[PDB]
Every structure is written in structure tokens, then in C-alpha cells.
Design a protein around this motif. Structure first.
Motif, PDB file in Angstrom:
ATOM      1  N   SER A 212     -85.144 -83.445  26.536  1.00 40.55           N
ATOM      2  CA  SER A 212     -85.089 -82.673  25.285  1.00 40.55           C
ATOM      3  C   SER A 212     -85.926 -81.401  25.426  1.00 40.55           C
ATOM      4  O   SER A 212     -87.160 -81.479  25.535  1.00 40.55           O
ATOM      5  CB  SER A 212     -85.562 -83.511  24.123  1.00 40.55           C
ATOM      6  OG  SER A 212     -85.516 -82.772  22.921  1.00 40.55           O
ATOM      7  N   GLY A 213     -85.261 -80.249  25.412  1.00 37.18           N
ATOM      8  CA  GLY A 213     -85.813 -78.988  25.906  1.00 37.18           C
ATOM      9  C   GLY A 213     -86.470 -78.163  24.824  1.00 37.18           C
ATOM     10  O   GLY A 213     -86.163 -76.975  24.710  1.00 37.18           O
TER      11      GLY A 213
ATOM     12  N   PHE B 237     -68.210 -94.922  19.416  1.00 38.22           N
ATOM     13  CA  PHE B 237     -69.485 -94.201  19.329  1.00 38.22           C
ATOM     14  C   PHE B 237     -70.626 -95.149  18.965  1.00 38.22           C
ATOM     15  O   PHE B 237     -71.695 -95.102  19.592  1.00 38.22           O
ATOM     16  CB  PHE B 237     -69.359 -93.071  18.309  1.00 38.22           C
ATOM     17  CG  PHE B 237     -70.628 -92.301  18.104  1.00 38.22           C
ATOM     18  CD1 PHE B 237     -71.585 -92.741  17.202  1.00 38.22           C
ATOM     19  CD2 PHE B 237     -70.868 -91.141  18.825  1.00 38.22           C
ATOM     20  CE1 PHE B 237     -72.756 -92.037  17.016  1.00 38.22           C
ATOM     21  CE2 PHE B 237     -72.038 -90.431  18.639  1.00 38.22           C
ATOM     22  CZ  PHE B 237     -72.974 -90.877  17.727  1.00 38.22           C
TER      23      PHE B 237
ATOM     24  N   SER C 261     -78.051 -89.861  22.210  1.00 39.75           N
ATOM     25  CA  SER C 261     -79.131 -88.884  21.985  1.00 39.75           C
ATOM     26  C   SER C 261     -79.104 -87.802  23.062  1.00 39.75           C
ATOM     27  O   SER C 261     -79.281 -86.612  22.756  1.00 39.75           O
ATOM     28  CB  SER C 261     -80.481 -89.580  21.934  1.00 39.75           C
ATOM     29  OG  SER C 261     -81.530 -88.658  22.158  1.00 39.75           O
TER      30      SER C 261
ATOM     31  N   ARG D 151     -76.156 -85.521  22.395  1.00 41.26           N
ATOM     32  CA  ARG D 151     -76.576 -84.679  21.265  1.00 41.26           C
ATOM     33  C   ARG D 151     -77.454 -83.530  21.764  1.00 41.26           C
ATOM     34  O   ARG D 151     -77.253 -82.369  21.365  1.00 41.26           O
ATOM     35  CB  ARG D 151     -77.299 -85.534  20.223  1.00 41.26           C
ATOM     36  CG  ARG D 151     -76.372 -86.336  19.320  1.00 41.26           C
ATOM     37  CD  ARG D 151     -77.182 -87.193  18.361  1.00 41.26           C
ATOM     38  NE  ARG D 151     -76.365 -88.131  17.597  1.00 41.26           N
ATOM     39  CZ  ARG D 151     -76.843 -89.009  16.712  1.00 41.26           C
ATOM     40  NH1 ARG D 151     -78.145 -89.078  16.466  1.00 41.26           N
ATOM     41  NH2 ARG D 151     -76.020 -89.824  16.067  1.00 41.26           N
ATOM     42  N   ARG D 152     -78.399 -83.830  22.647  1.00 38.94           N
ATOM     43  CA  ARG D 152     -79.361 -82.808  23.071  1.00 38.94           C
ATOM     44  C   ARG D 152     -78.679 -81.793  23.975  1.00 38.94           C
ATOM     45  O   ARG D 152     -78.918 -80.591  23.826  1.00 38.94           O
ATOM     46  CB  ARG D 152     -80.548 -83.471  23.766  1.00 38.94           C
ATOM     47  CG  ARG D 152     -81.424 -84.265  22.818  1.00 38.94           C
ATOM     48  CD  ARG D 152     -82.290 -85.253  23.560  1.00 38.94           C
ATOM     49  NE  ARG D 152     -83.063 -86.085  22.645  1.00 38.94           N
ATOM     50  CZ  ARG D 152     -83.804 -87.124  23.016  1.00 38.94           C
ATOM     51  NH1 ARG D 152     -83.865 -87.470  24.290  1.00 38.94           N
ATOM     52  NH2 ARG D 152     -84.472 -87.826  22.113  1.00 38.94           N
TER      53      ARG D 152
ATOM     54  N   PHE E  30     -75.673 -80.940  23.634  1.00 32.14           N
ATOM     55  CA  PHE E  30     -74.911 -80.092  22.712  1.00 32.14           C
ATOM     56  C   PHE E  30     -75.811 -79.062  22.045  1.00 32.14           C
ATOM     57  O   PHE E  30     -75.354 -77.940  21.781  1.00 32.14           O
ATOM     58  CB  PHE E  30     -74.223 -80.947  21.653  1.00 32.14           C
ATOM     59  CG  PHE E  30     -73.381 -82.054  22.216  1.00 32.14           C
ATOM     60  CD1 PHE E  30     -72.662 -81.871  23.384  1.00 32.14           C
ATOM     61  CD2 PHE E  30     -73.317 -83.283  21.579  1.00 32.14           C
ATOM     62  CE1 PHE E  30     -71.892 -82.893  23.901  1.00 32.14           C
ATOM     63  CE2 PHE E  30     -72.550 -84.311  22.096  1.00 32.14           C
ATOM     64  CZ  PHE E  30     -71.833 -84.111  23.256  1.00 32.14           C
ATOM     65  N   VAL E  31     -77.057 -79.430  21.747  1.00 32.85           N
ATOM     66  CA  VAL E  31     -78.010 -78.492  21.117  1.00 32.85           C
ATOM     67  C   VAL E  31     -78.229 -77.273  22.019  1.00 32.85           C
ATOM     68  O   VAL E  31     -77.985 -76.125  21.607  1.00 32.85           O
ATOM     69  CB  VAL E  31     -79.336 -79.206  20.800  1.00 32.85           C
ATOM     70  CG1 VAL E  31     -80.443 -78.197  20.506  1.00 32.85           C
ATOM     71  CG2 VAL E  31     -79.150 -80.181  19.648  1.00 32.85           C
TER      72      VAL E  31
ATOM     73  N   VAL F 107     -67.100 -85.378  16.648  1.00 34.35           N
ATOM     74  CA  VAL F 107     -67.887 -85.519  15.411  1.00 34.35           C
ATOM     75  C   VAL F 107     -69.165 -84.686  15.501  1.00 34.35           C
ATOM     76  O   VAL F 107     -69.648 -84.195  14.463  1.00 34.35           O
ATOM     77  CB  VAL F 107     -68.185 -87.004  15.134  1.00 34.35           C
ATOM     78  CG1 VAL F 107     -68.934 -87.190  13.820  1.00 34.35           C
ATOM     79  CG2 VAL F 107     -66.907 -87.827  15.144  1.00 34.35           C
ATOM     80  N   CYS F 108     -69.712 -84.507  16.706  1.00 34.38           N
ATOM     81  CA  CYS F 108     -70.990 -83.793  16.871  1.00 34.38           C
ATOM     82  C   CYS F 108     -70.817 -82.316  16.525  1.00 34.38           C
ATOM     83  O   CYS F 108     -71.535 -81.800  15.652  1.00 34.38           O
ATOM     84  CB  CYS F 108     -71.552 -83.961  18.280  1.00 34.38           C
ATOM     85  SG  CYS F 108     -70.763 -82.925  19.517  1.00 34.38           S
TER      86      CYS F 108
ATOM     87  N   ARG G 282     -74.844 -85.707  12.727  1.00 34.90           N
ATOM     88  CA  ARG G 282     -74.911 -85.143  14.080  1.00 34.90           C
ATOM     89  C   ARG G 282     -74.831 -83.624  14.051  1.00 34.90           C
ATOM     90  O   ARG G 282     -75.573 -82.973  14.811  1.00 34.90           O
ATOM     91  CB  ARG G 282     -73.739 -85.690  14.885  1.00 34.90           C
ATOM     92  CG  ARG G 282     -73.776 -87.197  15.021  1.00 34.90           C
ATOM     93  CD  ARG G 282     -72.501 -87.704  15.645  1.00 34.90           C
ATOM     94  NE  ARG G 282     -72.114 -88.990  15.078  1.00 34.90           N
ATOM     95  CZ  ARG G 282     -71.026 -89.676  15.423  1.00 34.90           C
ATOM     96  NH1 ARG G 282     -70.206 -89.217  16.357  1.00 34.90           N
ATOM     97  NH2 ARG G 282     -70.767 -90.835  14.836  1.00 34.90           N
TER      98      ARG G 282
ATOM     99  N   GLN H 195     -77.849 -81.130  15.176  1.00 32.73           N
ATOM    100  CA  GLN H 195     -77.587 -80.027  16.112  1.00 32.73           C
ATOM    101  C   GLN H 195     -78.144 -78.710  15.578  1.00 32.73           C
ATOM    102  O   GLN H 195     -78.780 -77.990  16.350  1.00 32.73           O
ATOM    103  CB  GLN H 195     -76.098 -79.898  16.395  1.00 32.73           C
ATOM    104  CG  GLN H 195     -75.612 -80.910  17.411  1.00 32.73           C
ATOM    105  CD  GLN H 195     -74.117 -80.841  17.613  1.00 32.73           C
ATOM    106  OE1 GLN H 195     -73.419 -80.061  16.969  1.00 32.73           O
ATOM    107  NE2 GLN H 195     -73.619 -81.640  18.542  1.00 32.73           N
TER     108      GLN H 195
ATOM    109  N   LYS I 190     -81.233 -76.721  17.145  1.00 32.70           N
ATOM    110  CA  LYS I 190     -80.948 -75.301  17.413  1.00 32.70           C
ATOM    111  C   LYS I 190     -82.001 -74.426  16.761  1.00 32.70           C
ATOM    112  O   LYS I 190     -82.488 -73.505  17.421  1.00 32.70           O
ATOM    113  CB  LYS I 190     -79.576 -74.913  16.878  1.00 32.70           C
ATOM    114  CG  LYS I 190     -78.435 -75.307  17.792  1.00 32.70           C
ATOM    115  CD  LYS I 190     -77.110 -75.207  17.078  1.00 32.70           C
ATOM    116  CE  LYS I 190     -75.946 -75.195  18.045  1.00 32.70           C
ATOM    117  NZ  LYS I 190     -74.680 -75.588  17.375  1.00 32.70           N
TER     118      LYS I 190
ATOM    119  N   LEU J 110     -85.084 -74.500  18.763  1.00 32.04           N
ATOM    120  CA  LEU J 110     -84.950 -73.661  19.974  1.00 32.04           C
ATOM    121  C   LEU J 110     -84.384 -72.279  19.657  1.00 32.04           C
ATOM    122  O   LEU J 110     -83.958 -71.576  20.601  1.00 32.04           O
ATOM    123  CB  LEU J 110     -84.058 -74.330  21.031  1.00 32.04           C
ATOM    124  CG  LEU J 110     -84.541 -75.624  21.676  1.00 32.04           C
ATOM    125  CD1 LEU J 110     -83.904 -75.761  23.046  1.00 32.04           C
ATOM    126  CD2 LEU J 110     -86.048 -75.598  21.795  1.00 32.04           C
TER     127      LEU J 110
END
Lengths: 56, 118, 56, 61
Positions: free
Chosen positions: B7-8, B52, B61, B64-65, B67-68, B102-103, D15, D19, D23, D26
Motif C-alpha cells: 500500500s503505497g 468476490f 485489498s 483495491r490498492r 486500482f488506487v 464493481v471497484c 469499493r 478508491q 486516491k 495519494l
């Protein structure tokens, strides 16, 4: 008056031939508002090479 | 803890995210490609088990990350290219798309687009 | 902005690891004190003395 | 030390929501305290002074 001309501020393995010269002149009566002047050479007597910063 | 560091927020702060993006992209590709067992084209009923909610929450998770820190359309295009190019581990890719749709915000149409092209 | 600063930092820490390895070679009498160090260091110097200190 | 202390200052449906939240975390921190930068650039100027003295002393020979 004592003026002192330091050719540079760093001490080496080999001690130079002149880390600094110093001159001293008697000031006499001077009086108020008057002014005295002295000229000094700083400038190349050897090699034509001066390293600058000079501190007078 | 590995997904936690992955997780960045602690990381993406210092490192410019041009090469950090390539890192995550190659990470995605390496998660996809590696260990292609259950290549059975008859992998139909396992979609129900790759649902899912059944897919582990740490997989969820990490997806998800990823995708972030990445973008939607570049991810979908990259997936189109990868799943066109090379073999697959189906459990991860199928649960991954299950999370994808869905994300990301309304990317059903852009998935259906390359599905229709394929 | 940040990308600028990180670009600077990497440009620096390469020349840093370069000079450090040069210092190690000096420590161990690797390159042999000759000249090639002097010219190298005065090139990592010349490299940095171009846009030295933008001041903001 | 400049870039490190800077980089430390630079750091300082569900979700879909997570996100945008992550976001927003970051959303890149483009800015850096100028007065710190200035303090470092003076430390630096004083070392630059020492290095440029040493370079004259050595590029003369």
C-alpha cells in the motif's frame, strides 16, 4: 596602527614562506577630523599568482 | 504486512510514480502469469467459488490498492493486451475482473467494449 | 514542486557514490595517487558548478 | 540531507469510495516549505565555499 595581511586561511602539510605579512606605523596626534593613508602591496612578487580571499 | 507496505502511501510519497507505476504493472503481470494450474477451459463452476465475497479479503485489498495507485482505462487496456498475449491463471484473473467491475467507477461499458472486440 | 527535487537528489547521489568509491581507491592506494583522480574530481566539480544554487 | 529532510516535509459503491479516499491520500503533495529549503541552501552555500577554495588550491597545481 598594526595592519596584518593574511594571504589565505588554510594550513597545509607544507608551511608556506608567508602565511601573512604585518606592518606597523606610529599614529601621531592625528587630531580630530584628520585622516592618514598607507598603501600596501598585496600583489604578485612571485609567480604572478595571487589566491583570493585576501584578508587585510 | 507485505500487502500493508505494498500500500503505497508511505512509499508513493517519496518515489516519483513513473517507475513505481511500472513496478505495479509488472507486479500485476507477475501475479497474473505465475503458476497457471487449473488452465481447464472447463473452469466454469469455479466462477461461483471465485465470487468476490468468497475470494480472500487480502487478495481483494491488494487488488483495491493496485486500482488506487493506477488508472482504470490503462489497467483495462493492459489486461486486454495481456489476456490476448499469454496464458492465464484463471482463479486470480476471474476474481480480479469480479473485483474490477464493481471497484472502478462505471467501467462496465469499457470492459464490454473490448469483450465485444474480442 | 517535488519531481524536480528528486531528480536533483538522484543526480547528486550518483556523483556521491562515484566520489566515495574514488575515496576508497585512494584509501587503499588503488588508482595510485597519480593524476587521474585530480582530473576526475575536477570534473565532478565542473559538473556541479554550472547551475550551482538556484536560490528560492 | 537537503533532499531527505525535504522528502520528510513533502510527506507531511464501498469499493469506489475507498478508491477515491486512497486516491485523495495519494493526491500528490506538490509543495515544500520554502524557509526550510532556504536554511538548507545556506548550509550548502557554506560547504560550497569550502569546496571552491579547495578546488582553486588544487587546479592551480
Amino acid at each position: 596602527l598594526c595592519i596584518q595581511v593574511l594571504t589565505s586561511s588554510c594550513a597545509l602539510d607544507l608551511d608556506s614562506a608567508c602565511s601573512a605579512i604585518t606592518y606597523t606605523i606610529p599614529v601621531d596626534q592625528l587630531g580630530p577630523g584628520a585622516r592618514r593613508e598607507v598603501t600596501l602591496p598585496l600583489g604578485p612578487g612571485e609567480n604572478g599568482g595571487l589566491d583570493l580571499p585576501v584578508t587585510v | 504486512c507485505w500487502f500493508g507496505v505494498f500500500s503505497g502511501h508511505t512509499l508513493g510519497s517519496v518515489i516519483s510514480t513513473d517507475p513505481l507505476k511500472r513496478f505495479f504493472s509488472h507486479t500485476l503481470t507477475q501475479i497474473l502469469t505465475h503458476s497457471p494450474v487449473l488452465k481447464a477451459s472447463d473452469a466454469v463452476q469455479m466462477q461461483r467459488e471465485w465470487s468476490f465475497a468468497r475470494t480472500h479479503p487480502l487478495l481483494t485489498s491488494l487488488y483495491r490498492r493496485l486500482f488506487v495507485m493506477l488508472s482504470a482505462e490503462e489497467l483495462v487496456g493492459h489486461l486486454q493486451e495481456v489476456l490476448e498475449t499469454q496464458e492465464v491463471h484463471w482463479q486470480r484473473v476471474l476474481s480480479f475482473v469480479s473485483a474490477l467491475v464493481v471497484c472502478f467507477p462505471e467501467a462496465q461499458q469499457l470492459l464490454e467494449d473490448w469483450v465485444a472486440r474480442l | 514542486r517535488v519531481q524536480y527535487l528528486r531528480q536533483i537528489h538522484a543526480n547528486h547521489e550518483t556523483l556521491l557514490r562515484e566520489v566515495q568509491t574514488l575515496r576508497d581507491r585512494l584509501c587503499t592506494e588503488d588508482e595510485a595517487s597519480s593524476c587521474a583522480t585530480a582530473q576526475r574530481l575536477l570534473q565532478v566539480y565542473r559538473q556541479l558548478r554550472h547551475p550551482s544554487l538556484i536560490l528560492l | 540531507s537537503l533532499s531527505s529532510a525535504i522528502a520528510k516535509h513533502e510527506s507531511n459503491p464501498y469499493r469506489k469510495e475507498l478508491q477515491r479516499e486512497k486516491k485523495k491520500m495519494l493526491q500528490t503533495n506538490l509543495k515544500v516549505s520554502g524557509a526550510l529549503y532556504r536554511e538548507i541552501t545556506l548550509k550548502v552555500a557554506e560547504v560550497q565555499l569550502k569546496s571552491d577554495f579547495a578546488a582553486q588550491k588544487l587546479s592551480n597545481l
